Every structure is written in C-alpha cells, then in structure tokens.
Amino acid sequence: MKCRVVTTTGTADWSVRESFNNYLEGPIANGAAYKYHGGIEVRDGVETTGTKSAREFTWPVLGSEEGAVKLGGGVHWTGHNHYSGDDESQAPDNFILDLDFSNPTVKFDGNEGTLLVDFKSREFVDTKTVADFLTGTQAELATITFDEPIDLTQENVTVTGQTKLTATGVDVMGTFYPEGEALAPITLNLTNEVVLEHH
C-alpha cells in the first residue's frame, strides 16, 4: 500500500488579546491598590517579547495529526492580589485574577478552525473574593476563520486566522468579554515534511 507520513514543526504567533495584556500588566490589575503584584510568566517553550499592548507570544509546534496542529507551552497571568499582610509566601495564593493557558491545539477543517486550550482560571465572583479555579482540558476557547484553507501537505505554510471567544471562553475570562468577542489573531508558521512510503 501507499502511506503518507507528515511531520509538522514550527510556531504559532498568538498574543491572546493585546488589550488584555495591557490591562493585566497595567495599573488597574497590578498598580497602587495592591501591595503584591503579579504579571505574566511563560513556560515550556513559549517565547515572549514586549509588554502590555506590545507583548507577543510564540507557541512551539509539537506536531500535527489529521485535522489538528498540536502546540506546547504555557502562559500564566496574575493580578488583583487580595493579600496585604507581610508574609510574601501567601501572595501566590491570593491573586483574584489567576489565569493559565497551556498546550493549545488548533483544530481545522478547510478555512475554519477551533482553538482548544488547557485552562485554569479563577471564577470572577466579585472584587473581594479569591474564588476557586475553573479548569478544562482541551476546552474550546475560540472559533477561528483562516485566510486560506489549511493544507498540511504543503511544505511551507504561513496562514492567519481571526479568533472569536466561545461561550465556554466567556467564563474563563471572568465574563468581561461577551460571547463572540474578537481575540488576538493566530498565525501558524509551519513546515510540513511529507514522506510517501510503499509499505
């Protein structure tokens, strides 16, 4: 028989949302109202440059399967720290806004797709509550429309998609965005090594 093996490498450029990074690193979430400040930490292969509205993230491609590009990496945002004592080891447990996205997956079919993410985010209850984390594994955070159909049999792919928050994503982001809210666009920078085997 004739078999096709596709090995996909590369990165995805996805800032999540510029105005969210601007707010989180700014004086509302991490200014003079709070004794302890948080910010943004990245891990597991994410690269980042800039701060606030200029911040960018690149996420490493782990590989592909039929209809999906699997990314690695994690980003953690923290703000609105509710703790004002003198024990700094308490601060990490007291950020009212405490959001983590990791291992995004881009599912696709032609020029449509879905952005899946592992998430851990405190629920927004009110401004005086450190609420319990909401969590999800490969949850649908956004829908995607690409500027061309995704074809992983092409060796070099650079394609950008617009993203819109899902109903699931509404609760992840504290209900501050409505369903359908635009998020940052996602660019896939892929190299697809296609090997045909008679085997």
Ligand code: HEM
């Ligand atoms: C003490 C608790 C909180 C306070 C006082 C607070 C305050 C604010 C304020 C005043 C804004 C509007 C800023 C602007 O429009 O320029 C805002 C925006 C926002 N907040 Fe928070 N917030 C809190 C908790 C949270 C939580 C837990 C989340 C969960 C992710 C969250 C997510 C957001 C988002 C997504 C926006 C929109 C940012 C944008 O414009 O892109 N907030 N918050």
Ligand SMILES: [Ca+2]
């Ligand atoms: Ca070539």
Ligand SMILES: [Ca+2]
């Ligand atoms: Ca292109």
